[PDB]
Design a protein around this nucleic acid. Structure first.
Ligand code: NA
Ligand code: NA
Ligand code: NA
Length: 223
DNA sequence: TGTATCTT
DNA sequence: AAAGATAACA
């Protein structure tokens, strides 16, 4: 079915044979059979399809997917045309235009162009029941996305991790703070953006850190 | 009504 | 665990 990127499957397929993951996917399937679950099944792992795992430079970690129709498509905070940017993404764009002087609102919500540059656009929980934020927490996704973070922590060098919100910040303990850069702030949702996201300057700080590590910076305007 | 984080 | 409070801004 070509839903998992090859390089990701190579390093993460060990999780597929573990009971927690088997039982997790059974739970999601039972949810789909009685409720609407987002994103659609072929888009749960879009974040594996945008770049090689060895080419990841930045990890943006959010909480869980958008819970409204036609919004989530497997890249955190992104929406496919023609759906308008949800409030969280409008807040991201709004921080981008104060933080990055060249950034202007791109007129859509598809962040695939960041992912193609090596920005991993991950959520801690990768499915959600329609209309109920974080309804699929504590079911097994956190152990899977822990394995993602742990692989990058151990096999990469000089990554920038942006942990947005309390649930994403639970991954901080798994990251070697002397070998990677961890920036943390509040979630960009309107319900929390006022607790630090506006003013966090994570996008310029990310490029500063990449620069100093001798890596190419993210062109936040490309997407 | 719609989109987190804290307290009990 | 979860209801309700707190929070801000359409
Ligand atoms: Na297990
Ligand atoms: Na479904
Ligand atoms: Na999403």
């Amino acid at each position: 079915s070509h839903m998992f990127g090859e390089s990701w499957k190579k390093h993460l397929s060990g999780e597929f044979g573990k009971p927690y993951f088997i039982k997790l996917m059974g739970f999601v399937a039972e949810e789909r059979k009685h409720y609407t679950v987002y994103p659609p099944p072929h888009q749960v792992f879009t974040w594996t399809q945008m770049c090689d795992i060895k080419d990841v430079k930045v990890v943006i970690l959010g909480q869980d997917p958008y819970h409204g129709p036609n919004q989530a498509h497997g890249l955190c905070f992104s929406v496919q045309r023609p759906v308008p940017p949800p409030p969280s993404l409008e807040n991201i764009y709004k921080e981008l235009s104060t933080d990055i002087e060249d950034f202007v609102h791109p007129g859509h919500g598809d962040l695939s162009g960041w992912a193609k540059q090596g920005v991993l656009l991950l959520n801690a929980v990768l499915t959600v029941r329609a209309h109920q934020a974080n309804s699929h927490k504590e079911r097994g996704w956190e152990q899977f996305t822990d394995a993602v973070v742990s692989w990058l922590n151990q096999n990469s060098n000089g990554l920038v991790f942006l942990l947005w919100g309390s649930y994403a910040q639970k991954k901080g303990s798994a990251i070697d703070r002397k070998r990677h850069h961890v920036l943390q702030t509040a979630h960009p949702s309107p319900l929390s953006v006022y607790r630090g996201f506006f003013g966090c300057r994570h996008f310029s700080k990310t490029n500063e850190l990449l620069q100093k590590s001798g890596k190419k910076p993210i062109d936040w305007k490309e997407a």
